[PDB]
Symmetry: C3
Subunit: 275 residues, 3 copies
C-alpha cells in the first residue's frame, strides 16, 4: 500500500493483522526497507498485534525523491503513515537509522501519544564527531561511505552485510548468502541518491535533545560487538539520557541481531511491550 | 498490469500476444510469481497463443494483503483476472500450488467453460496425512516449513531451490546459480505472511471433490523423483479421480521440471493443448 | 514516477536535481534499466545538473507490454517522458542500445532541439552483417542470444555480465559479484518477451539515416575491447557519419565501462558537455 506525503512523496508500507489489534510500527535501518523486518512482523502477528512497517523515502518501494533526506522529513513521513492509518498511540520499534527516526518522530510529533518505544542498535545520540561529542567517529569514515555509495554501490552493498553488519567476519561464524543477498537486494532497489544523503542524515544528526524529552518507557537493545553503531557511545548513552530508558545488552551480538538472533530479540521485545 | 479484486486486493498479471489469439492462463507455484513461467510464456507465444500469468495474492508484485490466503480466495482472484481480461474458455496450466488453484477455480466458477487444464507436479488431491489420506506426509513437515518462513526466510529460500526443488541436490547434477537466484528473488519480493499461510493452503486443502467434478480434458504431469510433492500421493491419484484425466509420468524428473526440462515439457504441453 | 504513453504503456523514470537546473537525460542499454546509471546520476547531481533516466518499455519497472519493441517505439516513449517533464533541449546520453534510442529520438522528434548527445559503446550504425554492412556480425550471433533469452534467461543473465560485458573474462581481471548480480537483477525484473524482441531492435536496426541528419555536437565513446558491440563496426563508423561528431577511444576498455571506469567516463562526459 501507499500513502502520499504533504510534500508529494509516495511512501510504501505493509500493514498486517486485525485493524483493531494493538499496533507496533517498525522502522528499518539504512539502506534497507520494510522487508528487513520479516521475522519480527510474523512473530508479533502470531502474538496478537497489528504490525506496520514502511519504506523510508527513496528506500525500497517508496518514491525515489531526490531531496528531503533528513531526519525531520523522515519523521514527517512517519506522521503521514500514522495519520493515514489512524495508528496513533502505537508502540514504535526502530533499528539503526530507524531508531533515530523513531526518536525524532517522538520529539517533533508529540501529538501522537506513542505508548512505548524500542531502539535496537540505534544511531542516537550522535555518530559524528563534534566539540560536544569528541567520541564521535570521524566524518572521513562517513565521507568514505558516501564515496562508496556514489562510485561502487553494487559491490559496497555486498561488502557491508558480508562483513561487519551481521558479524559474519568474526571467526568460526558461518555466513548466510540468503541474508547477505537480501540485504543487498533491499539496498539496490532503493535510490543511490537517497542512500547517499541518508548517510549524512543518520551520522550527523544530534538526537541528544530528543532523547531528554522522551518520557515514555523506552527499551534500548544493543549488542556489545556491534561493528556499525557504537554500543557505548550510542546504546548505553542513549539509555542513560532517556529519563525512562532501560538498557538490554547482548554479549557478542552484531548490528543485525534482529535477523540473526530473532528468537532472543523477539522474546525480549515482547516482554518489554507487555510491560 | 493490475486488476482490483472484489475484496480490494491488487493482482499483478502479464498478458502477452494477440488480443484474439487462443489463451493459455498459467498459474505459478509456492512461493513464486508469474516470472517463473518465462520459458513457457515465450514458447507458447511462438506457437500462436495469447499467454496470461498472474501473481498470487501476496506473491511477487501483487498486494501483500495479510489474510485470505486460502484456495477459495486464490480461485476467486483468478476469476477477477479472467473477467477483467475476458479470457473465459481458456486453457489453464498450473504448477504445484498453482495446480490446486486451477482445480479450485474450475470448481467454484463453472460459469467459465474452461477448454482444458494441465496440472504439473500439482498438489491435489491432498498432501498432508489424515484419516482419509493415510499415504500423505505428516503435518510436522509442513509445520517445519512454516517455521523456516517465519524465522529464516532469506536462507530457506536459497536452501529449497539449491536442494530439492530442481533436483540439484542429486549427486552428479550441475546446479544453476541463475535459476536458484531467480527462485529466491521471486520468493523474497513476496509477503512472508502470505507465504507462511500459503503452506497450509497448498498442503492441507483437499481437492478430491473438485477433481471428481471436472469433466473437461485434463493432463496430469508429474516427475517420479519429485522431492517437493510426492508423486504417488498426488499425480497418480488426481489423474484417476478426474473423469477425463490422464497421467503423464516423467522418470527421474524434479519438481521444477518445467524450468530444467522446458523443451520436453513444452512439447508435451503443446501436443495436449493443440 | 511514471508517464503514460500514447499507446498506454507505463514508463518508469527517475528525475533528480533542482527543477531549474540544466538537464541530462540518460538512456540505458539492453536488458537493463535506469538503475544502470547510478554512478553517472550522482556524479552529475554533484556537478549541479538535473538528471533524468527512464526504464525502456518492458524493462525494469516499466510496463511489460508485449509489443512495440522496436526503435521507433523506444523513441516515441522518450518523447512522452520529455513532454511530461518539460525537459526539451536537454543533453542526451545513451549507452549501448540506449545509444540507438538517442539517435532515433533525435531523428523522429526534431521539434525537441537537443543541445548535445553522447553515444557510449552504442549500437549505431548497424550491428548485423548485411550486404550494405559486410563488416557486421552474422545474424546467427543474435539468434543465439534470442534462444538463450527464450530457454535459459536466468543463467544467461549471469553469464553475460560474468563474462564479456565487463571484461571480467579477461586474464587477471577480478570480477565483482555485486556488479554481476546488479546486472542480472535489472534483467530479471524486465520482460522476457521485451528482451527477446529487443535483441532484434538493437542489432538489426540501421541508424545511418538518423546519424547523417544530426547536426548537434555528438561525442562517440567506445572501448576497443568491447566484446558486446564491436568497436570497428560501430563507434568508429558512427563518429564519421555524424556531421559534428567526434570519437573518443578507450584502449582496453569493456562494454560496461561507465560502471567499471566511472571516474574516467564521468570526467570525459563532463568535459564534453561543458565544452
Amino acid at each position: 500500500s501507499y500513502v502520499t506525503t504533504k510534500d508529494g512523496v509516495q511512501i510504501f508500507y505493509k500493514d498486517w493483522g486485525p485493524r483493531d489489534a494493538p499496533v507496533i510500527h517498525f522502522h528499518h535501518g539504512w539502506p534497507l526497507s520494510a522487508d528487513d523486518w520479516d521475522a519480527q512482523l510474523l512473530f508479533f502477528l502470531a502474538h496478537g498485534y497489528r504490525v506496520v512497517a514502511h519504506d523510508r523515502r527513496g528506500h525500497g518501494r517508496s518514491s525515489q525523491v531526490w531531496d528531503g533526506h533528513d531526519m525531520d522529513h523522515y519523521a514527517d513521513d512517519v506522521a503521514a503513515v500514522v495519520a493515514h492509518l489512524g495508528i496513533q498511540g502505537a508502540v514504535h520499534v526502530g533499528h539503526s537509522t530507524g531508531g533515530g527516526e523513531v526518536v525524532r518522530y517522538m520529539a517533533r510529533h508529540p501529538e501522537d501519544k506513542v505508548a512505548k518505544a524500542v531502539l535496537i542498535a540505534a544511531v542516537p545520540p550522535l555518530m559524528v564527531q563534534t566539540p560536544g561529542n569528541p567520541g564521535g567517529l570521524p566524518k572521513s569514515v562517513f565521507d568514505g561511505f558516501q564515496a562508496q555509495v556514489a562510485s561502487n554501490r553494487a559491490q559496497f552493498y555486498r561488502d557491508v552485510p558480508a562483513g561487519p553488519f551481521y558479524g559474519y567476519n568474526r571467526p568460526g561464524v558461518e555466513a548466510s548468502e540468503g541474508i547477505i543477498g537480501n540485504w543487498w537486494r533491499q539496498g539496490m532497489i532503493g535510490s543511490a541518491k537517497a542512500h547517499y544523503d541518508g548517510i549524512v542524515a543518520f551520522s550527523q544528526t544530534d538526537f541528544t535533545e530528543d532523547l531528554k524529552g522522551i518520557q515514555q518507557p523506552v527499551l534500548v537493545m544493543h549488542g556489545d560487538d556491534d561493528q556499525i553503531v557504537p554500543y557505548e557511545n550510542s546504546g548505553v548513552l542513549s539509555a542513560k539520557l532517556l529519563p525512562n530508558g532501560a538498557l538490554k545488552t547482548y554479549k557478542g551480538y552484531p548490528h543485525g541481531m534482529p535477523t540473526t538472533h530473532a528468537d532472543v530479540i523477539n522474546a525480549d521485545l515482547l516482554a518489554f511491550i507487555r510491560s
